[PDB]
């Protein structure tokens, strides 16, 4: 029977700027004489419907289209991709990264209590000595691995 509910404009005076949009449909005059806002000669409807049928040849098939258009410029990015999370050991001098905090040492279960917006703890003389695991939200102490 067919799907003729999908249409396209086929007339305009000029081309488009990138991602311009027009929904306004008016009787497209090539007459040079005004035609009352009514149809007829050299004033035509600017839109055209698609004539679809299941027995159409290849290329005459409905192809659903999606495009991507990205934003960067200045300001602080709002979007972000995914993230990997191997696993957390314990009691094995390790090389760790906690969402930005890069370090080395032995990780151990803690018994301190941060406030529920604090990520890591610091010592006097300003060295990172505790962190909070982002996924499970538990505090872990960071001790250096042995030297001497």
């Amino acid at each position, epitope marked *: 029977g067919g799907n003729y509910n999908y249409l396209y404009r086929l007339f305009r*005076k*000029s*081309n488009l700027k990138p991602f311009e949009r027009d929904i306004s449909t008016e009787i497209y005059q*090539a*007459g040079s004489t005004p035609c009352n806002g009514v149809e007829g*000669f050299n004033c*035509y409807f600017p839109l055209q419907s698609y*004539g679809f049928q299941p027995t*159409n*040849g290849v290329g005459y098939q409905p192809y659903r289209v999606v495009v991507l258009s990205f934003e960067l410029l200045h300001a602080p990015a709002t979007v972000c991709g995914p993230k990997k999370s191997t696993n957390l050991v314990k009691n094995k001098c390790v090389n760790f990264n906690f969402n930005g905090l890069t370090g080395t040492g032995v990780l151990t279960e803690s018994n301190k209590k941060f406030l529920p917006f604090q990520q890591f703890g610091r010592d006097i003389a300003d060295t990172t000595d505790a962190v909070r695991d982002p996924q499970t939200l538990e505090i872990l102490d960071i001790t250096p691995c042995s030297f001497g």
Partner: antibody, heavy 117, light 109 residues
Framework: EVQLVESGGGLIQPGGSLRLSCAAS????????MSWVRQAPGKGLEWVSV???????YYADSVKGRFTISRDNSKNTLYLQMNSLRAEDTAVYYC???????????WGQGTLVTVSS | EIVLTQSPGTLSLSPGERATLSCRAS???????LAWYQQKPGQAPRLLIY???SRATGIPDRFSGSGSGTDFTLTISRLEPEDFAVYYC?????????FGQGTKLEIKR
């Protein structure tokens, strides 16, 4: 809607160049498509080129790199400038008003393109 | 492939009778995206019918085109003698607009 007179063609030696003119009348020649079509004198009808109302042009593959179309909507005059003329492009040519589906509804009068000989 | 091929290529008849002819493609075309044309010799060729369904203005109704796919016909219901000319089929379904070669219509006085 009385329109599409043609002029300009005739005797021309090969290797030259010619701009043809098809003037129309009583019509907004800017806000539509026009086209060009040849007619070999022993053979059928073969499409040459099209313009858009936005202004985009297309050509046949044989006339690629050779033939340039243009128009002046201030004087309503289509211009077919053909260059690097070979001795097989010897047809009579027709300007044609174009609609929509690329039907050539209104037709010109014709003018002879004859290569040197 | 898109090549328009006439059925007979010429028809010599007597006026007042139903004329029928077709044009054959070289593949099945997307739906009814073709047309017909006629050519008066020494004159400009003229419109016949768009979309193989309905013809435009300036043309009376003695004429009818039908078909679907590869086959596509044209029927004139009664032979007007002054309509004797060379008649063309034209497509616009494919990415070029190809043509045929014509059909001669006349009488055998």
């Amino acid at each position: 809607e009385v329109q599409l007179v043609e002029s300009g063609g005739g005797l021309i030696q090969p290797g030259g160049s010619l701009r043809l003119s098809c003037a129309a009348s009583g019509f907004t020649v800017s806000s539509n498509y026009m086209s060009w079509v040849r007619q070999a004198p022993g053979k059928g009808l073969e499409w040459v080129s099209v313009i858009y109302s936005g202004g985009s042009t297309y050509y046949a593959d044989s006339v690629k790199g050779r033939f340039t179309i243009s128009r002046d909507n201030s004087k309503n005059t289509l211009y077919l400038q053909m260059n690097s003329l070979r001795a097989e492009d010897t047809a009579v040519y027709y300007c044609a008003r174009d609609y929509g589906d690329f039907y050539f509804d209104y037709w010109g009068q014709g003018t002879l393109v004859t290569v040197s000989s | 492939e898109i090549v328009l091929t006439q059925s007979p290529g010429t028809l010599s008849l007597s006026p007042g009778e139903r004329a029928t002819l077709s044009c054959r493609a070289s593949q099945s075309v997307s739906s009814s995206y073709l047309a017909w044309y006629q050519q008066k010799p020494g004159q400009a060729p003229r419109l016949l019918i768009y979309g193989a369904s309905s013809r435009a203005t300036g043309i009376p109704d003695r004429f009818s085109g039908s078909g679907s796919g590869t086959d596509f016909t044209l029927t004139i219901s009664r032979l007007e003698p002054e309509d004797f000319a060379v008649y063309y089929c034209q497509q616009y379904g494919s990415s070029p607009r190809t043509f045929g070669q014509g059909t001669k219509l006349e009488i055998k006085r």
